[PDB]
Structure formats: C-alpha cells, structure tokens
C-alpha cells in the first residue's frame, strides 16, 4: 500500500483517469476468448 499511494500522488497532479463507464453507458463489452 504505502509506496504505491505515494507513487499515485506523484502521478495524480499530472495524470487523468476515467474507467470506460463514461462511454459504456452506450457501448457493450468485449467478448474475450482464449
């Protein structure tokens, strides 16, 4: 936890994030196969 939380707070003042739900209101999943 601790080291990652500091590395996140280095990035977060100059990196954006979303998760695809801003468009997966309109779009369906990948059907993924092995």
């Amino acid at each position: 936890e601790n080291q990652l939380s500091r590395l996140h707070m280095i990035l977060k003042p100059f990196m954006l994030r979303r998760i695809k739900k801003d468009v997966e209101n309109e779009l369906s999943d990948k059907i993924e196969i092995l």
Partner: protein, 447 residues
C-alpha cells in the same frame, strides 16, 4: 471470458503387438523383469540384446538367428522388439514363410528380393532444377528440317532467365501441354517436367476454365539442392530392370503395361554393387545393413532352405531372423525327412538358436494387465485374476482375446470396468481350441 478447444481425429488402431516398445534391457545387457511393454523371457531377451548390438555394429554379413518355442511364447513379439529397438532408420524387412510361392518369379529368387530389400542405403542426391512461369517458348531448327535446340524463358519472384535447352525437354514440355503463363518445374538431372498450372497473375482471365491457378515461385530460376534419399538396394535392382525413368517413348510406354516381376540377372546386381561401392567411396552415401525377419520359416520348401545356404554365406547379405513353432516335423517338399523346427539340419548348423520358454500363471496376469492398459480398458482385481485362472486352463492368446468382448458387455449394461461376471459370461459364448475340440470330437458322427 470463454475458453475454446477441439480434437476429433481418430487414434491409430490398437494391434496384437502394439504394446511392444523395445527389449527392456538394462545397461549390463540383463533383461528387466517387466519393461518396454514386455514380461519374462529373460534367457531370450538377453540374446536378442546381443543381436541388436550385432545389427548396430554393421560388421557382419549373413549372420542368422532362429527364435524357437511353442505357439503363444512371444517369438514374433521379440522380433518386433528388435525392430523397435533399432528405431526407424535401420530397415527391418518383415516376411512370412509362405510369401516365397510367387506365381510370377521362382521361389529361390523371391528370397533374393527380400535379402536385397533388407540392405538400406542413404544418399545425398544433389539435384538441380529450373522453375518459374514460362514467359517464352521458342524452338530452334537444323538441316534435313527438324528441332535441335530450345529457348524457354522462365520468371520467378527473384528474377528471370532465358534458358537454352535440349530438344528432348521440348518434347517433354509438349507432352505436358505447357504454354506461356504456365508455372512449371524441370528436374535438370532427369529431364522431368511438372506443370503446376497458370500463374495467379492470370487468375480471372476467364469466367470458366478447368485450371487451378498457383502463386509465382520464389528464389532464382536455376538452383541446386541437397536432397537426402533413403532407399534399399532392391530399389536400385528393380528400377534398372524395368525403368520408368527418362522421357522417351519406350519408358513412357513401359510404365503403362502390366508391371510383372522378373527373375533379375546376377550381372545387374554386379553393376549395382559396383555403383554403390563408388557412392560410398565418394562419401556421397552411407550404408545401413538391417534385418530380414522370416516369420513362420518352417514351410519354406527344401528348394528355399538349400538356397538359404548360399545366401547366408554371401559377403553382401543382411542379418537374418527366423521364427518357428514346430516339433520334430516333416520338412515340406521332402515327404520322407523329419527334423527339428521343420528346418533341415544342413541349415540348422548355420543359425544361432534362441530358446523361448512357456509362461507361468504369474506372467499371464502381468501380460493381461499390460494388454488391458493398451486396449484402453479398466478391470477389477478378481476379474483380472479370473482371466489368469482361464489362462492356466486354456492359452495366453485366449485370455487376452476375452478382454474387449467383456468390455462391450460391461458398457452395454452401463459399467465403467470389466467385472468378473462379464469375463465369466463371455467364457460361455466364445469357446477356445481345447473346449471346441471336446464337443467336436463328441459330436464327430455329424460333421
């Protein structure tokens, strides 16, 4: 999310020796008690061990061994174990004694076909070839006029060349109906032409044509390659006796007529021997002298046995294995004469005899187990013991032969494995040689 796979290709079929994988020796040459799918027979498996050293030594010509012992003792299985222990490279030629009785060539010569087939040869054939799309085809003529020389233009992904060629290659191209835009391959050692079809560059020039088109060949037009050929001396003996090779009317005709065998002259084998001794001395070749195995040898004619004297002494001849299953039998073709193993004493001095034992009940169980896990079937302990019980009364082969009939009854009433009641029921349907001979001798008035 999803996982996918497929497989529905059928296995190789299971067969009466497919559990044999080798002699099952240790490094001292002793036999392991049960290994490589075999059991027992150590006094024979050790001896076969010395014979697979003998084959792999290459040194000897015409050494011969006779596997002798009752029916069901594994003599063919041990000869297959030798074949598996040599691997694919060394030729093992199987034969059955009654195969010598050809209707096309004398018995005495059918053996020489097998002797010459059991010597293998490996060759670096440095072929050279022309291939490409034919962009041009133009013949050239000489005085009384007729063809004399040929221009063929070939193209490939890596270039084009305007070749100058022999008029026999023009006759060969005309025979194959080759035209401009065809993709062809020419073997320059042999004059042989293969027309593949028109180049894919033309693939829609018609709405219908009989052709299947092909892609433009890669690399240069004229090239040589180091083909490795595995071949027997017999395959040199026969190809020179009725040649399909070359491009002339006579070879093209002789390929179509009925391919009768012919009694090959010793002088031709003299030429093949002189030829292959040059290929070995050039270092082009390797020789791989292998094995001829004659199962059921005991019904070769006294003609054949008396020929085998001269054959096994020849400084050319392959190593030989025989099998026999006969007592003090009368030798076929003699009517008067009785000898061990159905073999004349005159030949019996020339063979190292390997003696094959009968099985104990405790070896029957172990073969039957190894057989069941080869047939792909599961068996309970009292059921396997009942096949062993039957094997004491009847014979080894019969106790093996009851397995899959019982497995059908098992799954016909929904079970996963053979139980004793399935073996016990099967024994009521399928009689054996002994039990059938009883009812047949009782009812003998009616047959």
């Amino acid at each position: 999310k999803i996982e996918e796979v497929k497989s529905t290709t059928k296995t190789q079929r299971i067969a009466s020796h497919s559990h044999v994988k080798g002699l099952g020796l240790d490094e001292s040459g002793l036999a392991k008690q049960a290994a490589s799918g075999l059991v027992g027979q150590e006094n024979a498996r050790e001896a076969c061990g010395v014979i697979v050293e003998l084959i792999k030594s290459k040194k000897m010509a015409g050494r011969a061994v006779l596997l002798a012992g009752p029916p069901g003792t594994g003599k063919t299985a041990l000869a297959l174990a030798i074949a598996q222990e040599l691997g694919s490279k060394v030729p093992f030629c199987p034969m059955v004694g009654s195969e010598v009785y050809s209707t096309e060539i004398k018995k005495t010569e059918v053996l020489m076909e097998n002797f010459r087939r059991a010597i293998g040869l490996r060759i670096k054939e440095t072929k050279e070839v022309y291939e490409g799309e034919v962009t041009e085809l133009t013949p050239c003529e000489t005085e009384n006029k007729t063809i004399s020389h040929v221009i063929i233009g070939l193209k490939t992904a890596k270039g084009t060349k305007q070749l100058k060629l022999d008029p026999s290659i023009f006759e060969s191209l005309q025979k194959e109906r080759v035209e401009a835009g065809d993709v062809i391959y020419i073997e320059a050692n042999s004059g042989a032409v293969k027309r593949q079809g028109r180049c894919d560059t033309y693939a829609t020039e018609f709405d219908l044509e009989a052709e299947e088109y092909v892609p433009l060949p890669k690399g240069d037009v004229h090239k040589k390659k180091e083909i490795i050929q595995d071949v027997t001396l017999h395959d040199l003996d026969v190809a020179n006796a009725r040649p399909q090779g070359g491009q002339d009317i006579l070879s093209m005709m002789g390929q179509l007529m009925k391919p009768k065998k012919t009694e090959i002259t010793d002088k031709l084998r003299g030429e093949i021997n002189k030829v292959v001794n040059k290929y070995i001395d050039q270092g082009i070749a390797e020789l791989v002298p292998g094995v001829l195995f004659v199962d059921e040898v005991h019904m070769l004619d006294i003609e054949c046995f008396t020929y085998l004297h001269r054959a096994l002494e020849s400084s050319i001849a392959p190593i030989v294995i025989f099998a026999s299953n006969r007592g003090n039998c009368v030798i076929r073709g003699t009517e008067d004469i009785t000898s061990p193993h159905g073999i004349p004493l005159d030949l019996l001095d020339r063979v190292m005899i390997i003696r094959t034992m009968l099985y104990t009940p405790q070896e029957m169980k172990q073969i039957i187990k190894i057989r069941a896990q080869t047939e792909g079937i599961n068996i309970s302990e009292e059921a396997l013991n009942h096949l062993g019980e039957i094997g004491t009364k009847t014979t080894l082969r019969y106790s093996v032969q009851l397995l899959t009939p019982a497995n059908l009854l098992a799954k016909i009433n929904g079970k996963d494995s053979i139980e004793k009641e399935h073996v016990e029921e099967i024994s009521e349907l399928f009689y054996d040689a002994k039990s059938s001979a009883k009812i047949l001798a009782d009812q003998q008035d009616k047959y």
